[PDB]
Amino acid sequence: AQQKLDVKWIDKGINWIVYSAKDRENFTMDRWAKFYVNGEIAFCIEPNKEAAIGAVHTGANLDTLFKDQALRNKLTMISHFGYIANKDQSDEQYIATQMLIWELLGAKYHTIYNGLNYEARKADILKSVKEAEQRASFHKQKKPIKVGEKGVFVDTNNTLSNVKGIRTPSGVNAKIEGNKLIVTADKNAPDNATIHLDRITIVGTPLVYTSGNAQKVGVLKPFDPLDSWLTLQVIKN
Ligand SMILES: [Zn+2]
Ligand SMILES: [Zn+2]
């Protein structure tokens, strides 16, 4: 509930950006706060304010700050694919992710340090977020399957390589091989057995952290596994 805001400073003697956001006009950022809250990577979500480093914040659900769910979704997508689940953990990626989050909350960049490689970093993030909307060709379908008999289901949308986890009820085995979902169900399987193919396996509730009038900080956890799913109608006979 009550959490201290920690930081790691990114300072290379470089003006990272010259930006404007709300009342804050033509502000030069010559260092960057990489925020942590209780071990977890956080982002500033009010680009016109300074954060209260070292102070006790109160955690509340992200919806207290932002009503619009599509925005809340997008902010968690950018956090997730941009940095937390990204292969590149560099200071530059963190900054790019923070900067992209800030673009959605009204920040405008007049100057950007060329060494960020910002446009290329941003583009790869938006591609990852857009691809996460795509679902398998068998998404939401019901398919009959006899107990014992191994079934194969082809995803003609070419999305199964993005699957990070598989949930199945007891008595159902489900594996991925290329664009094929390989399935077998036994007598312990329920009559309608749903397989979930998750894109995200570190799902949680996104929190906003507030200390006084200082900058609000988000632990922007994705709250949806973004699964393609398929329901098997298990034939007992
Ligand atoms: Zn320094
Ligand atoms: Zn400074």
Short mmCIF file of C-alpha atoms and ligand atoms in Angstrom, two decimals:
data_model
loop_
_atom_site.label_atom_id
_atom_site.label_comp_id
_atom_site.label_asym_id
_atom_site.label_seq_id
_atom_site.Cartn_x
_atom_site.Cartn_y
_atom_site.Cartn_z
CA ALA A 1 0.00 0.00 0.00
CA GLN A 2 2.61 2.56 1.17
CA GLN A 3 5.76 2.45 -1.00
CA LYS A 4 8.96 4.52 -1.19
CA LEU A 5 9.92 5.92 -4.62
CA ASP A 6 13.45 4.81 -5.53
CA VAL A 7 15.54 5.98 -8.48
CA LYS A 8 18.62 5.24 -10.55
CA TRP A 9 19.99 8.35 -12.25
CA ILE A 10 20.93 8.32 -15.93
CA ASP A 11 23.42 11.16 -16.41
CA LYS A 12 25.89 11.33 -19.29
CA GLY A 13 26.36 15.14 -19.37
CA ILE A 14 23.95 15.18 -22.33
CA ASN A 15 20.82 17.26 -22.86
CA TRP A 16 18.46 14.34 -23.54
CA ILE A 17 15.52 16.46 -24.75
CA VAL A 18 14.13 19.96 -24.86
CA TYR A 19 10.36 19.52 -24.40
CA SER A 20 7.08 21.17 -23.46
CA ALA A 21 4.14 19.66 -21.56
CA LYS A 22 1.32 21.75 -20.02
CA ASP A 23 2.76 24.80 -18.11
CA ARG A 24 6.28 23.30 -18.37
CA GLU A 25 7.65 24.98 -21.53
CA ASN A 26 11.07 24.43 -23.19
CA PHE A 27 12.43 22.40 -20.26
CA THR A 28 15.93 20.94 -20.71
CA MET A 29 16.37 17.42 -19.31
CA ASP A 30 20.10 16.88 -18.81
CA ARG A 31 19.55 13.74 -16.70
CA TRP A 32 16.89 11.05 -16.41
CA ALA A 33 15.20 9.39 -13.45
CA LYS A 34 14.74 5.65 -13.89
CA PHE A 35 12.02 5.04 -11.31
CA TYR A 36 11.64 1.92 -9.17
CA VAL A 37 8.80 1.14 -6.74
CA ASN A 38 9.30 -1.92 -4.52
CA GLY A 39 11.72 -3.44 -7.06
CA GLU A 40 9.44 -2.84 -10.08
CA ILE A 41 10.12 -0.52 -13.01
CA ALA A 42 7.93 2.61 -12.93
CA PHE A 43 7.33 5.57 -15.26
CA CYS A 44 6.35 9.19 -14.67
CA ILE A 45 2.78 9.80 -15.90
CA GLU A 46 2.59 13.59 -15.46
CA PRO A 47 5.30 15.05 -17.77
CA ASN A 48 4.91 18.62 -16.34
CA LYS A 49 5.93 17.71 -12.73
CA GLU A 50 8.95 16.70 -10.65
CA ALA A 51 8.79 13.38 -8.76
CA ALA A 52 9.28 13.19 -4.95
CA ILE A 53 12.30 10.86 -4.82
CA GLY A 54 12.74 9.05 -1.49
CA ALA A 55 9.22 9.91 -0.27
CA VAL A 56 6.45 7.54 0.78
CA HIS A 57 3.73 7.31 -1.91
CA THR A 58 0.25 5.80 -1.67
CA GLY A 59 -0.64 3.15 -4.27
CA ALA A 60 -4.10 3.30 -5.86
CA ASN A 61 -5.46 1.64 -9.03
CA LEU A 62 -4.51 3.36 -12.32
CA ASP A 63 -8.19 4.15 -13.14
CA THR A 64 -8.25 6.87 -10.41
CA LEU A 65 -6.03 9.00 -12.70
CA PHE A 66 -7.24 7.92 -16.18
CA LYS A 67 -10.89 7.10 -16.94
CA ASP A 68 -10.29 6.10 -20.60
CA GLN A 69 -9.60 2.33 -20.72
CA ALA A 70 -7.99 2.39 -24.20
CA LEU A 71 -5.42 4.86 -22.82
CA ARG A 72 -4.88 2.74 -19.67
CA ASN A 73 -4.42 -0.30 -21.93
CA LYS A 74 -2.01 1.52 -24.25
CA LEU A 75 0.09 2.87 -21.35
CA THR A 76 0.54 -0.69 -19.98
CA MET A 77 1.32 -2.01 -23.50
CA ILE A 78 4.01 0.61 -23.97
CA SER A 79 5.47 -0.09 -20.52
CA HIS A 80 5.36 -3.87 -21.06
CA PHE A 81 6.64 -4.25 -24.64
CA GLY A 82 8.79 -1.10 -24.56
CA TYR A 83 10.88 -1.92 -21.52
CA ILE A 84 9.83 -4.57 -18.98
CA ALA A 85 9.50 -7.50 -21.42
CA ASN A 86 11.95 -5.97 -23.93
CA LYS A 87 15.26 -7.68 -24.82
CA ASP A 88 17.03 -4.29 -24.67
CA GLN A 89 17.23 -3.05 -21.04
CA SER A 90 19.46 -0.05 -21.92
CA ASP A 91 19.03 3.41 -20.42
CA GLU A 92 18.17 4.50 -23.97
CA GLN A 93 15.24 2.00 -24.18
CA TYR A 94 13.90 3.08 -20.78
CA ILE A 95 14.09 6.73 -21.85
CA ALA A 96 12.44 5.98 -25.22
CA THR A 97 9.65 4.10 -23.45
CA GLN A 98 9.14 6.97 -20.96
CA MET A 99 9.16 9.43 -23.88
CA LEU A 100 6.54 7.43 -25.79
CA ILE A 101 4.33 7.21 -22.67
CA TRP A 102 4.71 10.99 -22.37
CA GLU A 103 3.66 11.52 -26.03
CA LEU A 104 0.26 10.05 -25.10
CA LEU A 105 -0.01 12.39 -22.08
CA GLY A 106 0.66 15.65 -24.01
CA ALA A 107 4.46 15.99 -24.18
CA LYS A 108 5.91 17.62 -27.33
CA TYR A 109 9.62 17.29 -28.23
CA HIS A 110 11.44 20.23 -29.83
CA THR A 111 14.93 18.66 -29.66
CA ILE A 112 15.94 15.01 -29.22
CA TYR A 113 19.50 13.74 -28.63
CA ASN A 114 20.45 11.77 -31.79
CA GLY A 115 22.14 9.07 -29.68
CA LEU A 116 18.72 7.93 -28.40
CA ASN A 117 17.87 6.52 -31.84
CA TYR A 118 14.35 7.59 -30.82
CA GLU A 119 12.37 7.20 -34.03
CA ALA A 120 13.65 3.63 -34.57
CA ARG A 121 13.08 2.70 -30.90
CA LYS A 122 9.55 4.17 -30.95
CA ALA A 123 8.66 2.41 -34.24
CA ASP A 124 9.65 -1.05 -32.92
CA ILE A 125 7.49 -0.46 -29.80
CA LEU A 126 4.40 0.60 -31.80
CA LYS A 127 4.88 -2.48 -34.05
CA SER A 128 4.93 -4.74 -30.95
CA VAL A 129 1.79 -3.07 -29.53
CA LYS A 130 -0.10 -3.24 -32.87
CA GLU A 131 0.83 -6.93 -33.35
CA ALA A 132 -0.52 -7.76 -29.85
CA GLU A 133 -4.06 -6.87 -31.08
CA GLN A 134 -3.92 -9.75 -33.61
CA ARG A 135 -5.64 -13.02 -32.72
CA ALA A 136 -5.43 -16.59 -34.04
CA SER A 137 -7.76 -17.65 -36.89
CA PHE A 138 -9.51 -20.09 -34.51
CA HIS A 139 -10.06 -17.37 -31.84
CA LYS A 140 -13.41 -17.79 -30.01
CA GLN A 141 -14.28 -20.94 -32.03
CA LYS A 142 -15.72 -24.20 -30.71
CA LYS A 143 -14.22 -27.39 -32.18
CA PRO A 144 -15.28 -31.01 -31.55
CA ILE A 145 -12.59 -33.47 -30.44
CA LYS A 146 -12.88 -37.15 -29.42
CA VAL A 147 -11.23 -38.38 -26.21
CA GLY A 148 -7.87 -40.01 -27.00
CA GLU A 149 -7.51 -38.65 -30.55
CA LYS A 150 -4.79 -36.04 -31.00
CA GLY A 151 -6.09 -32.91 -32.78
CA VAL A 152 -4.18 -30.32 -34.82
CA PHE A 153 -5.48 -26.77 -35.34
CA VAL A 154 -3.75 -24.44 -37.79
CA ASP A 155 -3.58 -20.70 -37.12
CA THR A 156 -3.87 -19.17 -40.62
CA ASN A 157 -3.29 -15.67 -39.07
CA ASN A 158 0.38 -16.58 -38.32
CA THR A 159 0.34 -15.45 -34.64
CA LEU A 160 1.42 -18.50 -32.59
CA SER A 161 5.12 -17.46 -32.39
CA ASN A 162 4.05 -14.56 -30.06
CA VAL A 163 2.49 -16.98 -27.48
CA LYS A 164 4.29 -16.84 -24.10
CA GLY A 165 2.00 -19.13 -22.09
CA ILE A 166 -0.74 -21.73 -22.40
CA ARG A 167 -3.56 -22.36 -19.90
CA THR A 168 -5.52 -25.60 -20.10
CA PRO A 169 -7.96 -27.31 -17.75
CA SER A 170 -7.01 -30.66 -16.22
CA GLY A 171 -7.19 -33.56 -18.71
CA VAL A 172 -6.15 -31.38 -21.69
CA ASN A 173 -2.64 -31.25 -23.17
CA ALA A 174 -1.84 -28.38 -25.51
CA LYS A 175 1.45 -27.62 -27.29
CA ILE A 176 2.47 -25.21 -30.08
CA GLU A 177 4.62 -26.26 -33.07
CA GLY A 178 5.07 -23.43 -35.61
CA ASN A 179 1.54 -22.33 -36.57
CA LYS A 180 -0.09 -25.56 -35.33
CA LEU A 181 -1.87 -26.01 -31.99
CA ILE A 182 -1.42 -29.68 -31.02
CA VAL A 183 -4.14 -30.92 -28.64
CA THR A 184 -5.18 -34.09 -26.85
CA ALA A 185 -8.01 -34.37 -24.29
CA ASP A 186 -8.83 -37.31 -22.00
CA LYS A 187 -11.92 -38.37 -19.94
CA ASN A 188 -10.99 -35.99 -17.08
CA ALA A 189 -11.42 -33.05 -19.48
CA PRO A 190 -14.64 -31.11 -18.91
CA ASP A 191 -17.22 -31.26 -21.73
CA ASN A 192 -16.37 -27.71 -22.83
CA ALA A 193 -12.62 -27.24 -22.32
CA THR A 194 -11.11 -23.83 -23.11
CA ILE A 195 -7.45 -23.44 -24.09
CA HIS A 196 -5.90 -19.95 -23.67
CA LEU A 197 -2.84 -18.88 -25.68
CA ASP A 198 -1.48 -15.86 -23.77
CA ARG A 199 0.73 -13.12 -25.20
CA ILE A 200 1.45 -11.79 -21.66
CA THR A 201 2.25 -13.97 -18.61
CA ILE A 202 3.16 -11.24 -16.04
CA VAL A 203 -0.38 -9.94 -15.68
CA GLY A 204 -1.39 -7.72 -12.76
CA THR A 205 -3.25 -4.62 -11.64
CA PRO A 206 -1.64 -1.32 -12.72
CA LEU A 207 -1.05 1.10 -9.84
CA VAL A 208 -0.60 4.86 -9.64
CA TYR A 209 1.57 6.24 -6.83
CA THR A 210 0.99 9.71 -5.41
CA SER A 211 2.93 11.84 -2.91
CA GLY A 212 1.37 15.28 -2.29
CA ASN A 213 1.43 17.54 -5.37
CA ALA A 214 4.51 15.79 -6.84
CA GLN A 215 4.60 13.84 -10.11
CA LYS A 216 2.41 10.76 -10.13
CA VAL A 217 4.31 7.55 -10.94
CA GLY A 218 2.86 4.45 -12.59
CA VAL A 219 3.72 0.81 -12.15
CA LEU A 220 1.95 0.13 -15.42
CA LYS A 221 1.19 -3.58 -15.18
CA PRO A 222 -0.76 -5.14 -18.05
CA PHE A 223 -4.13 -6.44 -16.80
CA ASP A 224 -5.08 -8.58 -19.82
CA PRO A 225 -3.16 -11.65 -21.04
CA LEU A 226 -4.34 -10.85 -24.62
CA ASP A 227 -5.07 -14.52 -25.31
CA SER A 228 -6.31 -16.24 -28.40
CA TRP A 229 -8.67 -18.94 -27.11
CA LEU A 230 -10.35 -22.05 -28.42
CA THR A 231 -13.05 -24.16 -26.75
CA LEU A 232 -12.95 -27.92 -27.30
CA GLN A 233 -16.23 -29.84 -27.23
CA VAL A 234 -14.93 -33.09 -25.72
CA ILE A 235 -16.79 -36.13 -27.11
CA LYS A 236 -16.88 -38.95 -24.54
CA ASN A 237 -18.71 -41.78 -26.37
ZN ZN B 1 24.92 12.88 -12.50
ZN ZN B 2 19.98 18.89 -14.54
#
